[PDB]
Amino acid sequence: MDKYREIHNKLKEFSPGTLTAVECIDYLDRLYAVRHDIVDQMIKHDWSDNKDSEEAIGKVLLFAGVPSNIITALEKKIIPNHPTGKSLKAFFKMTPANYKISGTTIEFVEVTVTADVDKGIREKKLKYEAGLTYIEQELHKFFLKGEIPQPYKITFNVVAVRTDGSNITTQWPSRRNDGVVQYMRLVQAEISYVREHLIKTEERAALEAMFNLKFNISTHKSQPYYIPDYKGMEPIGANIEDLVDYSKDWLSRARNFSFFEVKGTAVFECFNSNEANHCQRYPMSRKPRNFLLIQCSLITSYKPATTLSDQIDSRRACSYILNLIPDTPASYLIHDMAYRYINLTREDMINYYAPRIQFKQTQNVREPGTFKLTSSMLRAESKAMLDLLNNHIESLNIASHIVQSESVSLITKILSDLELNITDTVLDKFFQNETQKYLIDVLKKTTAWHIGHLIRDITESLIAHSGLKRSKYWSLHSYNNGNVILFILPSSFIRFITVFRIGPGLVDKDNLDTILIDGDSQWGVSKVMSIDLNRLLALNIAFEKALIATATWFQYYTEDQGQFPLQYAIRSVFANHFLLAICQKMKLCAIFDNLRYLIPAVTSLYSGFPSLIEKLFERPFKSSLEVYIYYNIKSLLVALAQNNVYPSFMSRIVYKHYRSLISEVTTCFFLFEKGLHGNMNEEAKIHLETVEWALKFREKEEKYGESLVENGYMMWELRANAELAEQQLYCQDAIELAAIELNKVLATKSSVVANSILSKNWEEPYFSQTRNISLKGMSGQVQEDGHLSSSVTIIEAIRYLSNSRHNPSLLKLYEETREQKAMARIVRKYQRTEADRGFFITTLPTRCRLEIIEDYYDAIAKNISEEYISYGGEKKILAIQGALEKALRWASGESFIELSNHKFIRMKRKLMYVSADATKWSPGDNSAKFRRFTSMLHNGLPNNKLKNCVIDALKQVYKTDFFMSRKLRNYIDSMESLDPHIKQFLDFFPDGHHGEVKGNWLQGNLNKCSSLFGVAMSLLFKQVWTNLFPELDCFFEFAHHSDDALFIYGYLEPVDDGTDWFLFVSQQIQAGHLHWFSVNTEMWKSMFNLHEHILLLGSIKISPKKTTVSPTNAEFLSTFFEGCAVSIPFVKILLGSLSDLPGLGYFDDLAAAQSRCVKALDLGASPQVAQLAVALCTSKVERLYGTAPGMVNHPAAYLQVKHTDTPIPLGGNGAMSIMELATAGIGMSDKNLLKRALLGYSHKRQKSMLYILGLFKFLMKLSDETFQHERLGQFSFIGKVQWKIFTPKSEFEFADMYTSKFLELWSSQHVTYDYIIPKGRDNLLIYLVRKLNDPSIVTAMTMQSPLQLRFRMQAKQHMKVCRLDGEWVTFREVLAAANSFAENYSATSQDMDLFQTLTSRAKVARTFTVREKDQIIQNSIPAVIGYKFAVTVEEMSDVLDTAKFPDSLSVDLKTMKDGVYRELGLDISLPDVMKRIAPMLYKSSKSRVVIVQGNVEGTAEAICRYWLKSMSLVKTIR
């Protein structure tokens, strides 16, 4: 009653219509707490034994006399009839309201007060009675075992009181009822007063909506679903005995093994035969083609090129050139251009090097850095060269040793020239002592270092000429005191010529256009060569990529050998890396991709290495580099095959671990950019593959009939045909038997399976999910011309919502779009995004059906994650660990077989492991095989409605319309000679646009379904093998991870000599057991043969190329986990930070690069390598934006502070420590600087600290944007500088649906939608339109557009791309304005407060959180934030639907308020405080995965200590 007086007292002062929605929520909640507590306390005083606080069920049992060990044992048990399948451990922790113990009788009474007494009683009974009855039964079972002296009886009661308390005397007869009734009716009157008067009228509706949804949907429910009555399938009669008999008949004969024994002689013979075949089926060439994009040489140290030095170098270089005698038309062009450059005027010279802002047009110079060259002063040879230029397969003799000598000598000479020597933080100590000493100081004196810097300067000049207005003119540049000269022709592809002095370096004399002599000096003039933008960008960062690859190889060498590489080895590795980086060719990329699978194929007992070797000869060998690489691979593979200590691919060292050898080739493959993939050679290949598989499917349909191909063939048909066991066909009995075998293990967790399936939220709206409004590709609509548009899924979502009056759920959307035929096409390479996976994009209905199937199958398969399929986290290793431990335990034994009487034959148990890509999607698969599968699979639901929906979706994804690309159409229309295989491809498409494809789902997301199907087939194989040989204790296990699978076969071998075993096998054979012919020798071979045949019965073909068999697991502990999103090597992340930068501005480009480096560190990269990558990326960024010291936009040149005291958006550099970036974050440097400035100014009134504060205030004034969770950029807490952004030629569709002012107002008045996705149709439309206009979204959608790619390359050093006073100005103007503002700035109390607010072994996969989450906080942080900011009824409904526990939100809000006041020390109730500190909580909510080596736990401190330990490469520093 005292709490009621308290609440009434603090209700009295508030006038009606002044309390907010949340405050009214809290008032109502604690009023309900008091009114419940009155009855609870009265029952406690009358009958309950807990007078002070509620007690847990486990503690009640302990008090009642139940021993603790029995409770601990029972905690592992799961309640069978519990609706959620709760275990007894969780059941013990929850606290009933009242309990009493009388001898052996434990009586529980729960207190609830509600209008519907029966509903509350039923809810409490469902919560308590099932678990309590299970506990009582278990206690009786233990009593029967004698572990409990007396049996315990547990009874549960519910006392449910009406809202007016009229039934309290009937529910609980006591003499104190009248006072309780008076008190609770006073509470009810106060509740009515609060609900009806104290809330604002504009919020009132929301309140009742809350009051409807915070309770059990009293008067707010829709339930309009009515899942349609789709037809299912009737289970046919399938008997395991038929399959057993078929296997007996199949094994009675001899079957060919699908793999070959690995021997050095076999590999050498296969290589020789492939070479002989290749050299006779290709047109033979005697002249290797060019492979060096830039040819140059260096004899002295190279200084970076400057504008002043460039002029002098060009002058002296042209003076040298004019003294030469041309002999080729290219040399004539060179001489003409040099003569033109010499004959320019003084003002021409001034305007040539003048920046664009200071540039002035002239009769000879039209653009800066370029000059005009008319045809009048060109010579006849120059005109002929131009005319041949603008008016535009064979193989080398790899078998002949002459080409061997020539190519090997050339590449060895180039490498030898490259490797020739030319004439503080705790991390800093280790870096300067290990990495600087052994890597930087050695590679710094190499010729390749200066060659790479010269290459960077050359590529920078080429990019500078690549502008739209500059590509129409000629250009000349010089480098290294006139020793290198570059000529640019009027170029899309840019064309250039390089003239250098002959010397050590990148010289290929046989591919040079000519060599000129002027005495003792030789000048090599190369051919005019054309290069595109992607290769130019790859060349620009060639030095950085080579250095990163060398650092990674250094780290791996130290990890393997335990010491440091010698000088010559590291120099050779760097030379190889640089040579590979400078030569970007598709053939090299394919060769190195093939090597990643060739290496395991030769280091194991059996493999499919002939096919992999054959794949090396699929493309012609044109350059000498390809021959050298191929020969090095040949030698390495022959040595590896003869070795069954691992030789190194790059040097003369030998590794002790196979993972280092894998890492070498992985780094080699990742040295090649992804921009060269997807060209118009790989798209036609995929088109032809898909068309060929579709045509084969059509042929099988014509042969056996459509019904047999679609519904599968019968077993007796297989017994009479024996050709039906082929890919694209499946046996119904096999599918049903696999389903039964999987049900054998799925039947023990029916409740868990049903709960998991129903937890997928088949009722929540389709388009309110992040996966349906992402940036992934999608197929649009059939245009007028008849082609299929390539759009983005967000655009299609907007289009659908425009014509739809509501946001349908998944099942409803499937209902509306059920009759639309599925369509698919190949993604356009110019519209690919980062989130795109695969090459096929489908329409919206296809994605809906695939999502239905994927959700259903993932829900089913999650419940066996401990046994066969690994997803992630704790269950990512349990399946593999269990399989390996069981295999080892079984192998640690002997087998005994009874031949006759008690005499036994002894057998030694051996193991063999097979790794196969069984799960991987194949273009020749049949989806209809799933229809009979899910029809028989057991899900535990009480009805088949959802199962029938899944079956119907699988039926509707059977037929697809595959559309051919416009580019391929134009290319096929181009050539005059059509190949016979091209003719069939065209005949596949009847209208020239689309063709029907059946069976294949075209890379649709069905990975979990395929994995489950493969697991079922493996279980079927295990069962049938057990049935075949009951007397043999054969062993079989398997595991699946992503697309890979590992099978362990434990077989028996004859001990001593093989005499009794063959005798027993024969005796079985004459006994009628013909299937014992296969078990004679190498029983594992027959095991795998039967397993492969059974898998083929389900149309799963084990790849005869990439499958690896060995008696041990060396290639299987790495490849099995390779492919996951967490096992990705850090080399790709490190190399990707130097390219594909957002180009959104200096600050966020630097943030993206540093975040990529931090992520690479999290993937297992050494701290020193990560620091080097950070340094390289920042150097590149500062060079690009011109903020590096000594350059134009250096902050120190226009600010009164040092470079380290400048905010990052104003050209600052940040912490520059990878350890501080990983722990604190990217933007914590600004907060630290602001904290230092605040502390200095508030305690010493220092002028410079005030200047820093003024700089921060100016940054805040420039741009103060609110955080949106869909922004792909980096959010700045203390403001940012707005930069000019790429403008596409045509804006995306629907981007202009709403004006910018309307979207700004909508964002201002809807703060909740900055953290949650709206559920209503109109709100979702506005949200999606606003997202479509976000600059970080527009930039991401046009990531691969050529215009954006060129725009990112342009140096922003002298471009007006900064926003200031509503005008576009250069960066230094912004810096000057910032300085002027900071000079005349005075601190104010509001600014003071705002500033204070703004500042406040074995490899495993531990996942951590930056600051973790409070255990009291049950819902997600964004849900709680949306709850706090929600005002409108619609947004509150969206929050309530989004939250996992809508009832417990005010509790979470109060908990977060208390936590903020504890650690941050701020109060939430004040305005705008959350608008400032919410992004901090959002980032802290997210969790990050780190690859850690050791026994490190999941807490942040443990991983920090692990990184401290790994600070040193060689020695432990604990």
Coordinates of all heavy atoms in Angstrom, one line a residue, residues 25 103 309 361 453 537 598 615 741 750 787 837 863 896 908 929 1011 1020 1039 1188 1268 1305 1315 1375 1408 1474:
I25 N 3.4 4.6 -19.8 CA 3.7 3.2 -19.8 C 4.3 2.7 -18.5 O 3.9 1.7 -17.9 CB 4.6 2.8 -21.0 CG1 3.9 2.8 -22.3 CG2 5.3 1.5 -20.8 CD1 4.7 2.5 -23.5
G103 N 6.1 -31.7 4.3 CA 6.6 -33.0 4.2 C 7.2 -33.3 2.9 O 8.2 -32.8 2.5
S309 N 60.6 19.0 -61.7 CA 61.6 18.0 -62.2 C 61.1 17.5 -63.5 O 61.9 17.1 -64.4 CB 61.9 16.9 -61.2 OG 60.8 16.0 -61.1
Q361 N 43.6 28.3 -72.1 CA 43.7 27.7 -73.4 C 44.7 28.5 -74.3 O 44.8 29.7 -74.2 CB 42.3 27.7 -74.0 CG 41.6 26.4 -73.8 CD 40.5 26.1 -74.8 OE1 40.4 26.8 -75.8 NE2 39.6 25.1 -74.5
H453 N 58.0 2.1 -57.8 CA 57.7 3.5 -57.7 C 57.6 4.2 -59.1 O 56.7 5.1 -59.3 CB 58.7 4.2 -56.8 CG 58.4 4.0 -55.3 ND1 58.8 2.9 -54.7 CD2 57.8 4.8 -54.4 CE1 58.4 2.9 -53.4 NE2 57.8 4.1 -53.2
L537 N 44.5 0.6 -63.1 CA 44.4 0.6 -61.7 C 45.2 -0.5 -61.0 O 45.9 -0.3 -60.0 CB 42.9 0.6 -61.2 CG 42.5 0.6 -59.8 CD1 41.0 1.0 -59.7 CD2 42.7 -0.6 -59.0
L598 N 45.3 -28.6 -57.7 CA 46.3 -29.6 -58.2 C 47.2 -30.0 -57.0 O 47.6 -31.2 -56.9 CB 47.1 -29.0 -59.3 CG 46.6 -29.2 -60.7 CD1 47.2 -28.2 -61.7 CD2 47.0 -30.6 -61.2
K615 N 43.0 -29.9 -67.5 CA 42.4 -28.5 -67.5 C 43.5 -27.4 -67.6 O 43.1 -26.3 -68.0 CB 41.7 -28.3 -66.2 CG 40.4 -29.0 -66.1 CD 39.7 -28.8 -64.7 CE 39.8 -27.4 -64.3 NZ 39.1 -26.5 -65.3
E741 N 15.3 -42.6 -43.3 CA 16.5 -42.7 -42.5 C 16.8 -41.4 -41.7 O 17.2 -41.4 -40.6 CB 17.7 -43.1 -43.4 CG 17.6 -44.5 -44.0 CD 17.6 -45.6 -43.0 OE1 18.3 -45.4 -41.9 OE2 17.0 -46.6 -43.2
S750 N 10.9 -33.9 -32.3 CA 9.8 -33.3 -33.1 C 9.3 -32.0 -32.6 O 9.1 -31.1 -33.4 CB 8.6 -34.3 -33.1 OG 9.1 -35.6 -33.4
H787 N 13.7 -8.3 -74.0 CA 14.8 -8.7 -73.1 C 14.4 -8.5 -71.6 O 13.4 -7.9 -71.3 CB 16.1 -7.9 -73.4 CG 17.0 -8.6 -74.4 ND1 17.9 -9.6 -74.0 CD2 17.1 -8.4 -75.7 CE1 18.5 -9.9 -75.1 NE2 18.1 -9.3 -76.1
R837 N 26.4 -12.6 -55.2 CA 27.0 -13.9 -55.2 C 26.5 -14.8 -56.3 O 25.3 -14.9 -56.5 CB 26.9 -14.7 -53.9 CG 27.8 -15.8 -53.7 CD 29.0 -15.4 -52.7 NE 30.0 -16.5 -52.7 CZ 31.0 -16.5 -51.9 NH1 31.2 -15.6 -51.0 NH2 31.9 -17.5 -52.0
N863 N 18.3 -28.3 -36.4 CA 18.1 -29.2 -35.2 C 19.1 -30.4 -35.2 O 19.2 -31.1 -34.2 CB 16.7 -29.7 -35.1 CG 15.7 -28.6 -35.1 OD1 14.8 -28.5 -36.0 ND2 15.8 -27.6 -34.2
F896 N 36.9 -59.3 -34.9 CA 36.9 -60.8 -34.9 C 35.7 -61.3 -35.7 O 34.6 -60.9 -35.3 CB 36.9 -61.4 -33.5 CG 38.0 -60.8 -32.6 CD1 37.7 -59.9 -31.6 CD2 39.3 -61.1 -32.8 CE1 38.7 -59.3 -30.8 CE2 40.3 -60.6 -32.0 CZ 40.0 -59.7 -31.0
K908 N 42.5 -56.1 -38.6 CA 43.1 -54.8 -38.1 C 42.3 -53.7 -38.7 O 42.0 -53.7 -39.9 CB 44.5 -54.7 -38.4 CG 45.1 -53.3 -38.1 CD 46.5 -53.2 -38.7 CE 47.0 -51.7 -38.6 NZ 47.0 -51.2 -37.3
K929 N 13.4 -33.6 -57.4 CA 13.7 -34.7 -56.4 C 13.4 -34.2 -55.0 O 13.2 -35.1 -54.1 CB 15.2 -35.1 -56.6 CG 16.2 -34.0 -56.0 CD 17.6 -34.4 -56.4 CE 18.6 -33.4 -55.8 NZ 20.0 -33.7 -56.2
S1011 N 22.3 -29.8 -48.7 CA 23.1 -30.4 -47.6 C 22.2 -31.4 -46.9 O 22.7 -32.5 -46.6 CB 23.6 -29.3 -46.7 OG 24.6 -29.9 -45.8
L1020 N 21.2 -43.2 -45.7 CA 20.6 -44.4 -46.4 C 21.8 -45.3 -46.8 O 21.6 -46.5 -46.7 CB 19.9 -43.9 -47.7 CG 19.4 -45.0 -48.6 CD1 18.5 -46.0 -47.9 CD2 18.8 -44.5 -49.9
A1039 N 30.6 -35.8 -42.4 CA 30.3 -34.4 -41.9 C 30.2 -33.5 -43.1 O 30.8 -33.7 -44.2 CB 31.4 -33.9 -41.0
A1188 N 49.0 14.7 -47.9 CA 50.2 14.3 -47.4 C 51.2 15.5 -47.1 O 51.0 16.5 -47.8 CB 50.9 13.3 -48.3
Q1268 N 21.8 6.7 -39.8 CA 20.9 5.8 -40.3 C 21.6 4.4 -40.5 O 22.7 4.4 -41.0 CB 20.4 6.3 -41.7 CG 19.5 7.6 -41.6 CD 19.1 8.1 -42.9 OE1 19.4 7.5 -44.0 NE2 18.3 9.1 -42.9
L1305 N 11.9 16.3 -44.0 CA 10.9 16.5 -43.0 C 10.5 15.2 -42.4 O 10.3 15.1 -41.2 CB 9.7 17.3 -43.6 CG 9.8 18.8 -43.6 CD1 8.4 19.4 -44.0 CD2 10.2 19.3 -42.2
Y1315 N 16.3 3.4 -36.9 CA 16.9 2.2 -36.3 C 16.1 1.0 -36.6 O 16.6 -0.1 -36.4 CB 17.0 2.4 -34.8 CG 17.8 3.6 -34.4 CD1 17.2 4.8 -34.1 CD2 19.2 3.6 -34.3 CE1 17.9 5.9 -33.7 CE2 19.9 4.7 -33.9 CZ 19.2 5.9 -33.6 OH 20.0 7.0 -33.3
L1375 N 39.9 24.4 -45.8 CA 40.8 24.5 -44.7 C 41.0 26.0 -44.3 O 41.1 26.3 -43.1 CB 42.2 23.9 -45.1 CG 42.2 22.4 -45.2 CD1 43.4 21.9 -45.9 CD2 42.1 21.7 -43.8
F1408 N 33.1 -12.1 -30.4 CA 33.2 -11.2 -29.3 C 32.3 -10.0 -29.5 O 31.7 -9.8 -30.6 CB 34.6 -10.8 -29.0 CG 35.2 -10.0 -30.1 CD1 35.1 -8.6 -30.0 CD2 35.9 -10.6 -31.1 CE1 35.7 -7.8 -31.0 CE2 36.5 -9.8 -32.1 CZ 36.4 -8.4 -32.1
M1474 N 20.0 11.0 -26.6 CA 20.0 9.8 -27.4 C 20.3 10.1 -28.8 O 21.1 9.3 -29.4 CB 18.7 9.1 -27.3 CG 18.5 8.3 -26.0 SD 19.0 6.6 -26.2 CE 17.4 5.8 -26.6

